[PDB]
């Protein structure tokens, strides 16, 4: 059954960057992203 719940905020998914000591990450492919911004004038 549905109910009102209280919790602590989740700031985000914890990602451990695989920082290595002579290793790099390079992208092999891309996307074109069209985002939107609204501004009162």
């Amino acid at each position: 059954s549905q109910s009102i719940i209280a919790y602590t905020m989740s700031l985000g998914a914890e990602n451990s960057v695989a920082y290595s000591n002579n290793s790099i990450a390079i992208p092999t492919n891309f996307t074109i992203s069209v985002t939107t911004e609204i501004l009162p004038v």
Binding site: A18, S20, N22, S23, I24, A25, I26, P27, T28, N29, F30, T31, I32, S33, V34, T35, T36, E37, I38, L39, P40, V41
Partner: protein, 238 residues
């Protein structure tokens, strides 16, 4: 082109379903309407007088006795007007700041390509398109997002002949056995070559330098031409 078309097609739904944005213009409209409603509803308050209607005070009292109630109403309504004007001035300052930002975004995102991070969208800004909205502007920011990364073994320099070679514009990568030089934003590997790198000093200074052959196009072309010339000579000399 297909990716841009798909994104601009999804724009027509993301602009009205995900909420988030597009509520700022509605907030402006609601704030203005609510302020006007409060100002016009402050006219039914008495502020200590016998009535909030001026005609009733003028019709039921003598001038010297009606003047007190008239002054009470004047004080209350004047205070309401100054409150409304002050809030309008503060909101106008806020809207002017927003409009200055919008003009800057039009100049730098639409009229040019911006290297300012996150100024014209999330990612590497490509371009921007303006659209008009009631009392506002909408920027469609077209940006470049690297998608499918792969991690390689990288080195700062390559040691070939007792000399350190650094990429002209790129990064040295290794897929496990061979070493290439690529561009930092898109995996396009190429053979390490004297036209791909520049020499600076010897191999005793750089931390992390590795051995790999920097192939010289001039020397190999000269050797191939000399081999062809030797074949041409042996065609008739021997």
């Amino acid at each position: 082109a297909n990716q841009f078309n798909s994104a601009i097609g999804k724009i027509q739904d993301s602009l009205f379903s995900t909420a988030s944005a597009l509520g700022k213009l509605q907030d402006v409209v609601n704030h203005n309407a609510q302020a006007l409603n409060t100002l016009v509803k402050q006219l039914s308050s008495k502020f200590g007088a016998i009535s909030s209607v001026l005609n009733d005070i003028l019709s039921r009292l003598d001038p010297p006795e009606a003047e007190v109630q008239i002054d009470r109403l004047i004080t209350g309504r004047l205070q309401s007007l100054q409150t409304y004007v002050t809030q309008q001035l503060i909101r106008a300052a806020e809207i002017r700041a927003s409009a200055n930002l919008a003009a800057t975004k039009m100049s730098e995102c639409v009229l040019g390509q911006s290297k300012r991070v996150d100024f014209c969208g999330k990612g590497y800004h490509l371009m921007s398109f303006p659209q008009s909205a009631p009392h506002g502007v909408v920027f469609l920011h077209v940006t470049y997002v690297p998608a499918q990364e792969k991690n390689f073994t990288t080195a700062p320099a390559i040691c070939h002949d007792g000399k350190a070679h650094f990429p002209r514009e790129g990064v040295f990568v290794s897929n496990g056995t061979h070493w290439f030089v690529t561009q930092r934003n898109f995996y396009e590997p190429q053979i390490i070559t004297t036209d791909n790198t520049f020499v600076s000093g010897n191999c005793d200074v750089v931390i992390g330098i590795v051995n790999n052959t920097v192939y010289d196009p001039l020397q190999l072309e000269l050797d191939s031409f000399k081999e062809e010339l030797d074949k041409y000579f042996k065609n008739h000399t021997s």
